[PDB]
Design a protein around this nucleic acid. Sequence first.
RNA 1: AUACA
Lengths: 110, 110
Amino acid sequence: MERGEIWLVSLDPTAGHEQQGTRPVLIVTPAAFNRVTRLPVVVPVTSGGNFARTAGFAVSLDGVGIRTTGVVRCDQPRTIDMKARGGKRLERVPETIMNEVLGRLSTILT
Amino acid sequence: MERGEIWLVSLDPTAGHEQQGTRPVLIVTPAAFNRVTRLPVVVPVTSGGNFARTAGFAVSLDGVGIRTTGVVRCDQPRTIDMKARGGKRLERVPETIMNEVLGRLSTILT
RNA sequence: AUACA
């Protein structure tokens, strides 16, 4: 597992109003960290608004030519289980998208 | 965050190696988001028993004079609900300790 | 009451 890779996993079961529904998550933490900690920080992919681009907490996606149709959002993230659920590797996003995600996590730290 | 907000809420339900159980948690999300989506991210507190010590990401709430004698897991935060689940603030953590937690939470930007 | 169980 490397940085910028997209792994399919489920965030459920959810309660109240969490981000429910199986979707591919993006690996935010570097391989070195994931290797020793074995707990990678991931962000959920949801909708945005009009187009699959930057929507506040949602980062831009459509433009690099990917198979995953959606918008990466760093609004409601959480370190879920990737041991019993199992992650399925799909594809990977360019460094362009990686920088986008790394700029939304700072806005939640307050 | 809003600074110094230790709320008690039920982390359940959960599945896999994720945090669960009704215990005090430290919110990370700021007022500009906590009062918007109503879905904040909380850091699970882990009781130390009679004494606690700071280590790595584990922030020690014990020492300065706090009721909650334990360490916060600034490694596995989960997005939950703070309206339907039902939460209540127990005590207010000193600004000194609050800064320590935030400093540990800065490791997720690596 | 920024969400594709």
